[PDB]
Amino acid sequence: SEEIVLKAGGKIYQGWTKIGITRSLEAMSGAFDLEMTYKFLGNDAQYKAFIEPIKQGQACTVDIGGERVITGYVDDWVPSYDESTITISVSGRDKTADLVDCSIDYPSGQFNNQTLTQIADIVCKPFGIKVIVNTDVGEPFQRIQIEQGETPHELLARLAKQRGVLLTSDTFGNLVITRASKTKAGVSLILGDNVKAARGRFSWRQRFSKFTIKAAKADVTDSEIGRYRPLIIVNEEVTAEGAAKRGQWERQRSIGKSNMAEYTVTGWRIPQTGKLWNINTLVPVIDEIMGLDEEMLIASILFSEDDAGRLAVISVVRPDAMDIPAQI
Amino acid sequence: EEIVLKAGGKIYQGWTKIGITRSLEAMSGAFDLEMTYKFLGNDAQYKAFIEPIKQGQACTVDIGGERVITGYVDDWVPSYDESTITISVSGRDKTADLVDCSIDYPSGQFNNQTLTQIADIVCKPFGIKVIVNTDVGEPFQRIQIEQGETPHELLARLAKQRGVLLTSDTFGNLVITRASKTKAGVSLILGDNVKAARGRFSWRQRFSKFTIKGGIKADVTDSEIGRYRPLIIVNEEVTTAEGAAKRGQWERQRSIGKSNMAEYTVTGWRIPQTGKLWNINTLVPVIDEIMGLDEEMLIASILFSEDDAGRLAVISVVRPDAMDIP
Amino acid sequence: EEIVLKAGGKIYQGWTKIGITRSLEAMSGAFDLEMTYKFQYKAFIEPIKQGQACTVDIGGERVITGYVDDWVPSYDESTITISVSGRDKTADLVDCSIDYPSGQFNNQTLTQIADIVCKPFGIKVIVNTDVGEPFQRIQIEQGETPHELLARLAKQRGVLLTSDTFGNLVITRASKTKAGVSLILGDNVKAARGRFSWRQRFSKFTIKADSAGLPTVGGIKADVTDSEIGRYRPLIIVNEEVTTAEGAAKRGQWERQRSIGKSNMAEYTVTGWRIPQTGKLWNINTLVPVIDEIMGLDEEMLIASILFSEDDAGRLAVISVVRPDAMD
């Protein structure tokens, strides 16, 4: 019922024929793609241009029922046509994409005795991006030097990793500093109830029984893997406690990379709560077919619409799969 | 007019599928030619209709008697099943050898030679001729051949230094040229002669400012890009503020061509007005309100295709300043 | 002849989509087994857990011995799809690092070293050919896998590594053993496909180990010519390993034979997994006469790999054939 609207350039664009919006905890800035395909059966499409182009670069919002889904910029304007077809589409990312694409211009080239939050405030400001803090960022860093051509995202992400926190964004394209949430979606995904379809992949191709980390050592065991499968790794950033932490990070990364579960539901809104499905919320999962019975963390959502209807694809992970400690 | 492949004293025409690509940006023209027969009877199945065309043979492709490819068959691609037999050949201009093969030049160095002189030397043993179409500029004081370097790789970096383009002609010669101002003799007009078109206009790789790097730094601004989007690049090759400005302009220019694409599909391979095949490196006026184009564009690439339905030219156009590298 | 997966104390029958690869080119091959059940949102079997030891047989004959890599469940409103995939046991040699605290092998043959590195994986080494002289000193490269190490040794001894149906490591040579069947166009070939190219073929292979007024001259070098490429097409390759002129020529010839293999493809589709004339499964590393006027083949070819597949229509074997001379 609620309509989905793209606003760009003081203009309003509704009636799209295909919409895909990603929100994600693992890919800074997510994505939107909107397409409108008209067919002209009089074979006179080329005499029947309808909208003025959406300029690439334009500030952009997508709303459902007046509620914000994504805030960013048009990356790509993508027109095409033939004798009986006009297709226009735009693609882009939320505001934080500037943090991913662009260089840090902080002329003194180093931060002194600053927390992650103070640094993020600095590098984000000339992009007009707000920094939201939802967790303890811990101690200041004594001295941080900008690497050559380092982007605001690459800097913040490396700092984040030394403080055991995560970087993401909100629906308003603000930078969010957080940790894996305790907040509940207010809903379960129950096989036979609200799950329209689902898909999984559970692998040991990248799983190992023992991670040995060497400076250039320390063993980190993964007791889930009951066959002899050793992995030795040099990591020149490494301390015996440091190598153990990097080994633990290594076990944790291989686990997340080896499990996938994606649930397709009807609607972008949770019917119980009436709230949009949201990343970094916890959702009980009861799925006998797949072999899941645990509370999971929503890591990503694909919100889509076509002729068939509105769907949301919810990618879920073990809630401590995105929880780390700190770097060297 | 037939498309004729000539190879090994033999002549082949009557292809059921054709794709011939020529490009200002490519080191060699390319072809793909296929003969298929379907719904074969019980006695017709599993029977060769042609002696295999051997890979590696010198060949030419002509369209209506006019050369479009002078090179070699790269690939012999036969296939069949219970009701079908398909044979296909693909290949490239002679200048393919400059892309595939190593420079063998015992001394490993050129001294006080121009791009042209160096090109002449490295192409020579492949029996490839160099055609010079533009100002090649100053000689290079000293050039070393890097380990395993190909003629294409060497000549490419030299052309980058001099602001010129490397391509081939229809005769398999190496052509050193620049973007021309030669007119195509026709316009691409929405509602007139365009069958289909597609485009992509992106700011993904566009920046508001290019800062290059010594003590020397220079800011080259891109006025097309109206959001704060800085890029900082260090180049240890630059030693001057004029050098840093020059590399910044080179970086800005490169980001344009990389960010825009437009492709026009028209009926037939020849321009009706002139009777000639569409040609690369010519200027074509484009009036197209759906894309958002109302200007002269440069033809960078053409695919001449044919199948069941008929013949199409797919013409890739770029803003002419995208081809002018300084 | 039913095809079965034996894993986890059970024999699984009723697979509807099967793909099994045996290859001289890809250590460990692959299996993929899938079942689609048209029925709502209810598990009918228990998850087939990734990691389990497993066997695939056809008509009681062993085809692959290894582990389940992936458990790939899915479902929608009307169907449940269950999918497993894996490798052969030798996959552990491909995935994993060598854990050998000495770091070096002294005065050992290829066989002795293979005996050592396969042992903790529980993989028997089968030797079916003269492995030749011992190596004097072999150092294990940083994070070297057992297959990596043995593969670089095996090429210096003019031999090949593969696997048997029991997941043992096999050290062998291009075989003289005939398959007992010819592949003949109009006879037993359902479909075939080929690509014969000179894109990666060269006339001469040269392998090698402020301007100087007096450059240092000489150096370790060898030329190896490919008489079949009748045009000037030279390739110069700097191998930093090679310290001898004899070694560079052996590298050169290897490079020439590899180019031939890389440049030709021929794949024959036949009905069935067994050879009607012998009753045996098609086997890699056996010779097959090929007669084929469409492609232009009239030679004895070696089987380099087989894809055994099954679906709705029935069982096919895709036999990938190669010139023997460029394997020996």
Interface test with B, best of A75, A86, A125, A129 (most B CBs within 10 A): A75
Q: Is C283 helix (H, G, I), strand (E, B) or coil?
A: coil
Distance CA A244, CA A225 (A): 18
* All chains having 3 or more CB pairs closer than 8 angstroms to chain C: A, B
Distance CA C105, CA C113 (A): 7
Q: Of A70, A12, A64, which is closest to residue A268 (Cα–Cα)?
A: A64
Q: How far is CA C9 from the centre of its chain?
A: 29
Distance CA A24, CA A28 (A): 7
Q: Of B168, B203, B156, which is closest to residue B72 (Cα–Cα)?
A: B168
Contact B80, C324 (CB under 8 A): no
Distance from CA of C165 to the nearest CA of A (A): 20
Interface test with C, best of B101, B112, B123 (most C CBs within 10 A): B101
Interface test with C, best of B79, B89, B110 (most C CBs within 10 A): B79
Where is the domain boundary, A244, A259, A274? A259
- Examine the domain organization and report whether B46 and B183 are in the same domain: yes
Question: What is the radius of gyration, based on Cα positions, of chain B?
Answer: 23
- Examine the domain organization and report whether C227 and C113 are in the same domain: no
CA distances from A93 to A27, A68, C223 (A): 11, 14, 54
- Chain A residues within 8 A of B196 when measuring between CB atoms: 80-83
Q: Of C60, C61, C67, C2, which is closest to residue C29 (Cα–Cα)?
A: C67
Distance from CA of C46 to the nearest CA of A (A): 7
- Chain A residues within 8 A of C97 when measuring between CB atoms: 212, 230-232
- Examine the domain organization and report whether B208 and B315 are in the same domain: no
Eight-class DSSP state of C178: B
Question: What is the radius of gyration, based on Cα positions, of chain C?
Answer: 23
- Examine the domain organization and report whether A269 and A251 are in the same domain: no
Distance from CA of B140 to the nearest CA of C (A): 14
C125: which strand partners?
C169
Label the pairing between strands C264-271 and C191-197.
Answer: antiparallel
- Chain C residues within 8 A of A200 when measuring between CB atoms: 71-74
- Examine the domain organization and report whether A278 and A196 are in the same domain: yes
Contact A326, A162 (CB under 8 A): yes
- Examine the domain organization and report whether A154 and A188 are in the same domain: no
Q: What angle do CA A140, A141, A145 make, to 5 degrees?
A: 145
Distance CA C260, CA C323 (A): 8
- Examine the domain organization and report whether B59 and B165 are in the same domain: no
- Examine the domain organization and report whether C192 and C291 are in the same domain: yes
Q: Of A111, A126, A269, which is closest to residue A187 (Cα–Cα)?
A: A269
- Name the interface residues of B facing C (CB cutoff 8 Å): 45-48, 51-52, 54-56, 72-82, 85, 87, 97, 100-102, 104, 109, 125-127, 142, 147-148
CA dihedral over A219, A220, A225, A231, signed as positive or negative? negative
Residue among C194, C234, C296 minimizing CB distance to B79: C194
Contact B176, B133 (CB under 8 A): yes
Q: Is A13 helix (H, G, I), strand (E, B) or coil?
A: strand
C77, burial (CB in 10 Å: exposed 0-12, middle 13-18, buried 19+): exposed
User: Tokens 């370790």 sit at which residue?
Assistant: C220
Contact B202, A56 (CB under 8 A): yes
B209: phi then psi, degrees, rounded to nearest 5:
-150, 135
Q: What share of chain A is helix, strand, coil (3-state, %, to 5)?
A: 15, 45, 45
Contact B213, B245 (CB under 8 A): no
B91: which strand partners?
B31, B73
Q: What share of chain C is helix, strand, coil (3-state, %, to 5)?
A: 15, 40, 45
Distance CA A98, CA A123 (A): 11
Distance CA A178, CA A134 (A): 5
Could you give the count of Cα atoms lying within 13 Å of C60 in the half-sphere of its Cβ? 0
Cβ within 8 Å, pair B56-C201: yes
Q: Tell me the count of A-B CB pairs closer than 8 A.
A: 84
Q: Of B66, B27, B297, which is closest to residue B177 (Cα–Cα)?
A: B27
Cβ within 8 Å, pair A291-C47: yes
The CATH number that applies at residue A293 is 2.30.300.10
Where is the domain boundary, C212, C236, C264? C264
Distance from CA of B180 to the nearest CA of C (A): 32
List Cβ neighbours of A145 (8 Å cut-off, separation of 6 or more). A109, A110
What's the residue count for chain B?
A: 326
- Examine the domain organization and report whether B235 and B245 are in the same domain: yes
- Examine the domain organization and report whether C249 and C277 are in the same domain: no
- Chain A residues within 8 A of B227 when measuring between CB atoms: 57, 73, 98
B61: which strand partners?
B5, B69
Kindly identify which residue of chain B lies nearest to residue A89, measuring between CA atoms: B200
Eight-class DSSP state of A125: G
Rounded to whole angstroms, the maximal C-alpha distance in chain C is 83
Residue among B197, B206, B211 minimizing CB distance to A80: B197
- Name the interface residues of B facing A (CB cutoff 8 Å): 190-191, 194-204, 206-207, 211, 225-234, 265, 289-292
Distance from CA of C207 to the nearest CA of B (A): 10
Residue type, A293: D
Residue among A77, A81, A103 minimizing CB distance to B196: A81
- Examine the domain organization and report whether A29 and A86 are in the same domain: yes
Residue among A46, A79, A98 minimizing CB distance to B199: A79
Contact B260, B320 (CB under 8 A): no
The CATH number that applies at residue A123 is 3.55.50.10
Where is the domain boundary, C211, C229, C264? C264
In order, the DSSP letters of C136-150 are EEEEPPTT--HHHHH
B95: phi then psi, degrees, rounded to nearest 5:
-65, -5
* Angle between helical axes of C146-156 and C110-118 (0-180°, round to 10): 170
A34, burial (CB in 10 Å: exposed 0-12, middle 13-18, buried 19+): buried
Distance CA B114, CA B162 (A): 10
- Examine the domain organization and report whether A78 and A125 are in the same domain: no
Torsion of CA B237, B243, B248, B249, to 10 degrees: -130
Label the pairing between strands A230-234 and A210-214.
Answer: parallel
Contact C256, C205 (CB under 8 A): yes
Method used experimentally: X-ray
The full 3-state SS of B250-297, as one line of letters, equals HHHHHHHHHHEEEEEEEECCECCCCCCECCCCCEEEEEECCCCEEEEE
Distance CA B252, CA B219 (A): 11
Distance CA C93, CA C140 (A): 14
Distance CA A259, CA B206 (A): 36
Cβ within 8 Å, pair A229-C77: no
- Chain A residues within 8 A of B265 when measuring between CB atoms: 82
Interface test with A, best of B201, B212, B256 (most A CBs within 10 A): B201
Residue among A79, A127, A148 minimizing CB distance to B290: A79
- Chain B residues within 8 A of C299 when measuring between CB atoms: none
Q: Can you point out the beta strands (E) in C180-251?
A: 183-184, 191-197, 204-208, 221-225, 234-238
User: Tokens 């010129």 sit at which residue?
Assistant: B164
Q: Of C165, C192, C190, C181, which is closest to residue C315 (Cα–Cα)?
A: C190
* Element housing B166 (H / E): strand B165-168
- Chain C residues within 8 A of B45 when measuring between CB atoms: 186
Alpha helices, H only, chain B = 96-100, 115-123, 151-162, 241-259
- Chain B residues within 8 A of C233 when measuring between CB atoms: 97, 100-101
In order, the DSSP letters of B12-54 are E---SEEEEEEESS-SS-EEEEEEEE-S--TTTTT--SSPPPP
List Cβ neighbours of B62 (8 Å cut-off, separation of 6 or more). B3, B4, B6, B68
- Chain C residues within 8 A of A288 when measuring between CB atoms: 42-43
Interface test with A, best of C70, C80, C147 (most A CBs within 10 A): C70
Distance CA A48, CA A321 (A): 52
Domain of C76 in residue numbering reads as 1-88+174-196+266-328
Q: Provide the number of structural domains found in chain B.
A: 3
Residue among C51, C71, C142 minimizing CB distance to A226: C51
Distance from CA of B233 to the nearest CA of A (A): 6
